[PDB]
């Protein structure tokens, strides 16, 4: 054949029995919106919708067809259940050669049209078309960049973040659901039902989800998707969050042709962050997709109840405009009860904290929320107070106006960053405890709150990396106080013997995925999940999954080229 639109891609004339049920796709693919969307390309070269890359036609044809296809795995007969397969492999022999479509994605971000949405669609086309009828994801065998931890050449670790630096949340899950219809309708539809139940069951939780938690439709037709605001509030955010990372670990799986066991396998680490730990745990021990399921039920109800209850502590207090203004001028912004005091030191971060509480009543006082990074140091307390710290915080801070230009270090002043984060609640707090213990019980109160010695790999703690298995606390009683009470000291939670780190951190290159990197510069090669974008071989991600003939190696600062010695062919040192 010949996928048109000014760009040609031969489609081996199926010869007769094919070429007949083919043009039925030839003109249907000539879907009116392809010709006028091809006229926006003879000049505005592939303005939009398809065509981008010369071999991208194979996309929509091998997509549109891969959909109006069988419309059920139970073959809608050869019509669209074989005609679709002559081409499927036909595609797997153009510019992919196995290696995985996700990898052929790189062959776009850098080569031709630097487009994201034009590549994301591209994937969905494949993966979906593939699982539509024959060729299901299973073959198990993978390229490389993964043999490593299996041949002893490397070691892998896993991590999961939370309330990561993103005011989107759902903007990831939707753009995760839509992305791969196939590879997650499960966890999705599943967790859907799941949460949809954990409501009527905790009768009282119905007064905390004003915005119907019908996380279902929210995807298909966001037309009535409950705000952008409260879609973030703790109950509802907590769950869907893991859902994401879980969904990924899944895709990470299903893709890789494995099973949650085939993955809890190649590993050794797996350590989440606060709302990200709950994921690590429930992820450690998971075998086939038969066990893998209720396995999720856990995590879900977990974060679920944490949120639901934590929300009943000191929920979203009606923020005062009296401040919204002033705060929005210094540009600190979203007053949010949690702050990121970057570029500085603890104690320093402390001192300030101190003096503030000093005069401040006990209840409104504030703690040093996190300790991720050697500098970074999130803090939190009632929405208010926090800013009141920013007060003294500002005055002392320097406007970034040249001062070193003429002798600094001695008199020169400091530099900051006092912004807040996308987090309705004050995790790890001094007010998120009276309800803490309750969730512990709220756990058992639902025949699933366990996490026994089934601890596959060593899932490091929120405080001091211990296999988390030292019992005497059920874990599902620590994975509570380590969150809604105790700090994180992350640098202390890392102390890994890794070569890489897989972070299904909560959407984009801003959810620990990179921070973890920050702290260390000459060790792992931290790679993340969703998102295909790149940079400069620093923290390669999203595509380092199905990579073939390309291994990660973030040079070690000492090992990598360290002092040496040698002598001359005439006997001389050097």
From Swiss-Prot:
Active-site residues from the entry: 274 (for acetyltransferase activity)
Region (Acetyltransferase) location: 1-468
Residues with the N-acetylmethionine modification: 1
Additional remark text: Present with 91800 molecules/cell in log phase SD medium.
Function recorded in the entry: Fatty acid synthetase catalyzes the formation of long-chain fatty acids from acetyl-CoA, malonyl-CoA and NADPH. The beta subunit contains domains for: [acyl-carrier-protein] acetyltransferase and malonyltransferase, S-acyl fatty acid synthase thioesterase, enoyl-[acyl-carrier-protein] reductase, and 3-hydroxypalmitoyl-[acyl-carrier-protein] dehydratase.
Family to which this protein belongs: Belongs to the fungal fatty acid synthetase subunit beta family.
Subunit structure: [Alpha(6)beta(6)] hexamers of two multifunctional subunits (alpha and beta).
Name this protein carries in UniProt: Fatty acid synthase subunit beta
Organism for this UniProt entry: Saccharomyces cerevisiae (strain ATCC 204508 / S288c) (Baker's yeast)
Name of the encoding gene: FAS1
Coverage span on the entire protein: 1 to 545 of 2051
């Amino acid at each position: 054949m010949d996928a048109y639109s000014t760009r040609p891609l031969t489609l081996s004339h199926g010869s007769l029995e094919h070429v007949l049920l083919v043009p039925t796709a030839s003109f249907f693919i000539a879907s009116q919106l392809q010709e006028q969307f091809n006229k926006i390309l003879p000049e505005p070269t592939e303005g939009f919708a398809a065509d981008d890359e010369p071999t991208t036609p194979a996309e929509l044809v091998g997509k549109f067809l891969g959909y109006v296809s069988s419309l059920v795995e139970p073959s809608k007969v050869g019509q669209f259940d074989q005609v679709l397969n002559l081409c499927l492999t036909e595609f797997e022999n153009c510019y992919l050669e196995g290696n995985d479509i996700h990898a052929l994605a790189a062959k776009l971000l850098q080569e031709n049209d630097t487009t994201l949405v034009k590549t994301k669609e591209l994937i969905k086309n494949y993966i979906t078309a593939r699982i539509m009828a024959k060729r299901p994801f299973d073959k198990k065998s993978n390229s490389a960049l993964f043999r490593a931890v299996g041949e002893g050449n490397a070691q892998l670790v896993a991590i999961f973040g939370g309330q990561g630096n993103t005011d989107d949340y759902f903007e990831e899950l939707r753009d995760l659901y839509q992305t791969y219809h196939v590879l997650v309708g499960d966890l999705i539809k599943f967790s859907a039902e799941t949460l949809s139940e954990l409501i009527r069951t905790t009768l009282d939780a119905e007064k905390v989800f004003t915005q119907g938690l019908n996380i279902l439709e929210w995807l298909e037709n966001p037309s009535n998707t409950p705000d952008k605001d409260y879609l973030l509030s703790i109950p509802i955010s907590c769950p869907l969050i893991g859902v994401i990372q879980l969904a990924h670990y899944v895709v990470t799986a299903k893709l890789l042709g494995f099973t949650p066991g085939e993955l809890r396998s190649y590993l050794k680490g797996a350590t989440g962050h606060s709302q990200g730990l709950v994921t690590a745990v429930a992820i450690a021990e998971t075998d086939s997709w038969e066990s893998f399921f209720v396995s999720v039920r856990k995590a879900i109800t977990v974060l679920f109840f944490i949120g639901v209850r934590c929300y009943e502590a000191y929920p979203n207090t009606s923020l005062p405009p009296s401040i919204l203004e002033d705060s929005l001028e210094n540009n600190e912004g979203v007053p949010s009860p949690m702050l990121s005091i970057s570029n500085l030191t603890q104690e320093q971060v402390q001192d300030y904290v101190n003096k503030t509480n000093s005069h401040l009543p006990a209840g409104k006082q504030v703690e040093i929320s996190l300790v991720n990074g050697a500098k970074n140091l999130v803090v939190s307390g009632p929405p208010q107070s926090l800013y009141g710290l920013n007060l003294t915080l500002r005055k002392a801070k320097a406007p970034s106006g040249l001062d070193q230009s003429r002798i600094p270090f001695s008199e020169r002043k400091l530099k900051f960053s006092n912004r807040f984060l996308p987090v309705a609640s004050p995790f790890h707090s001094h007010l998120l405890v009276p309800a803490s213990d309750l969730i512990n019980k709220d756990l058992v109160k639902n025949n699933v709150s366990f996490n026994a010695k089934d601890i596959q790999i060593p899932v490091y703690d929120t405080f001091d990396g211990s296999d988390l298995r030292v019992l005497s606390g059920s874990i599902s009683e620590r994975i509570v106080d380590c969150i809604i009470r105790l700090p994180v000291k992350w640098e202390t939670t890392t102390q890994f013997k890794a070569t890489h780190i897989l972070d299904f951190g909560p959407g984009g290159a801003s959810g620990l995925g990179v921070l973890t990197h920050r702290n260390k510069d000459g060790t792992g090669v931290r790679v993340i999940v969703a998102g295909t974008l790149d940079i400069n071989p620093d923290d390669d991600y999203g595509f380092k999954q199905x990579x073939x003939x390309x291994x990660x190696x973030x040079x070690x600062x000492x090992x990598x080229x360290x002092x040496x010695x040698x002598x001359x062919x005439x006997x001389x040192x050097x």
